[model samples]
Target: KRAGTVCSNCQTSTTTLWRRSPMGDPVCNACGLYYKLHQVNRPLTMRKDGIQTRNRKVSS
Candidate 1:
């Protein structure tokens, strides 16, 4: 989460990434971007959190 530490997902700061997802799930900071890019018309699933599933799409 440094000043220049860009997140591969959101293309933002690692700090912003953690701030958005406090629990630190594997969804990545650029989850929103993923949804946009992965418009394959398929059901894009996402994990919840470092502790649980956020989207509730998957059963962890």
Candidate 2:
């Protein structure tokens, strides 16, 4: 909203070098690296919690 560049997906402020998405939207380095490795946009939830999986119940 303010006068600053942010990741198109996560909306994180990239102080250093930023990247561009396939649609030419500004993305942070972390998100860009994720896309390059997984070939998919980083989940918005991931930004909140790094690579955390859902808690599953264990059988007794």
Candidate 3:
């Protein structure tokens, strides 16, 4: 595709960070964690609308 990376499993083009799959292909974080946890391919249909945005809690 263009000059951007896409997830090998989920086919998503965005992520907080890029992850590596078993063969070292590019993968997204969500897919990486789910697969790592469940030991199965994260369903592409279960892909999120977008990455979750969380409020930063800065340490005082």
Candidate 4:
């Protein structure tokens, strides 16, 4: 996956936000967000590029 970036803690590929881990490895947005919020490391659910999801369905 060219678009996917490797995460340090879990070594998973993600197309979301990539930040340097504490040990200097690549991390995904979810992981980074979790660490920032909870001061803990967690794996992230990766998503395909350019794809968006909504909680509610649209009415046409």
Pairs of residues clashing in candidate 2: none
Ten-residue region with minimum lDDT total, candidate 4: 43-52
Off by over 4 Å in 4: 1-5, 43-60
Q: Model 2 TM-score?
A: 0.53
Residue-wise C-alpha lDDT for candidate 1, range 10-47, written one tens digit per residue: 34443324333445433334454455676632232433
Superposed model 1: Cα runs more than 4 Å off: 14-60
Query: lDDT of each structure?
Result: 0.40, 0.64, 0.76, 0.60
- lDDT digits (tens) for residues 1-60 of candidate 4: 445456665565643466765677786666678777878756445444343356766675
Error of 1 at 52 (Å): 22
| Backbone clashes in model 1, listed as residue pairs | 1-15, 9-30, 10-30, 48-53, 48-54, 49-52
User: Which ten contiguous residues of candidate 2 have the minimum total lDDT?
Assistant: 46-55
Worst 10 residues of 3 by lDDT: 1-10
Task: TM-score winner between 2 and 3, please give it.
Answer: 3
lDDT-superior candidate, 3 or 4: 3
